[PDB]
Design a protein around this ligand. Sequence first.
Ligand SMILES: CCCCCCCCCCCCCCCC(=O)OC[C@H](COP(=O)(O)OCCN)OC(=O)CCCCCCCCCCCCCCC
Lengths: 12, 233
Amino acid sequence: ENALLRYLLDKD
Amino acid sequence: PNVPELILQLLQLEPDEDQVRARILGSLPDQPAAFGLLCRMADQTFISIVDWARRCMVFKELEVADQMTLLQNCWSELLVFDHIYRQVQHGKEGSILLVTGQEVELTTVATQAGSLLHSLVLRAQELVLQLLALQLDRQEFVCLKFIILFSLDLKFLNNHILVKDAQEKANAALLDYTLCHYPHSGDKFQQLLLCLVEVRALSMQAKEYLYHKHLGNEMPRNNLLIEMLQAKQ
Ligand SMILES: CCCCCCCCCCCCCCCC(=O)OC[C@H](COP(=O)(O)OCCN)OC(=O)CCCCCCCCCCCCCCC
């Protein structure tokens, strides 16, 4: 799973 | 006149009022291309596209896993389409407009770009020319990018019901608008869908250009587009 996408969607 | 309500709601979400450019953060006798900075600029544009998508109707109602799949499916298409529409707004055959406000002459890319990048740029400009001949407008633009966002087969997601509705409502909206606003020859709905096929083909060439740079260790070490490339599509 894409850690970057989770980050940008969760927050920044 | 009676613009579909989905298209109306999407225009209200469109962030551009000069704000995209301000928010973009690479922090500011002619010369070689500023490669690392161009990379940075593209990464920040990706960021802003995810910001856009997470504010979109339907999308913001899905759970994170589905949101990720959808964006994993379309991220390169959204970036290419973002660049393309910028070029229709620019309306100059001789140069490229970047999100920073900077224009790059096509002769410049002919002198500096390798085989792959040069092909890509040129093929993209052909598509710009096509959308200009169809008199592409901002209403169509935001509808088409919502369509790209939800252009994933239902089977790959948990929530079928809502994604199917979005896919159907988005196409219906485009047809309704083109039919009412472009009473000219050619089926504009269908022509625009054909354009989306080209956006997808372009975005595939773009990932391959990216992958080429990556194998030769030419990309910045913490590039976002490479991180997106490497995560299982
Ligand atoms: C999937 C993502 C898509 C993002 C698209 C949105 C951003 C548009 C950016 C376009 C900038 C062009 C300036 C070129 C000036 C020049 O001629 O410079 C030539 C240099 C070097 O060229 P070379 O690498 O061939 O190496 C030759 C030497 N060995 O290249 C650049 O500096 C390009 C830097 C781009 C970095 C961001 C990565 C974006 C991915 C694909 C870009 C192609 C998109 C084209 C449209 C489909």
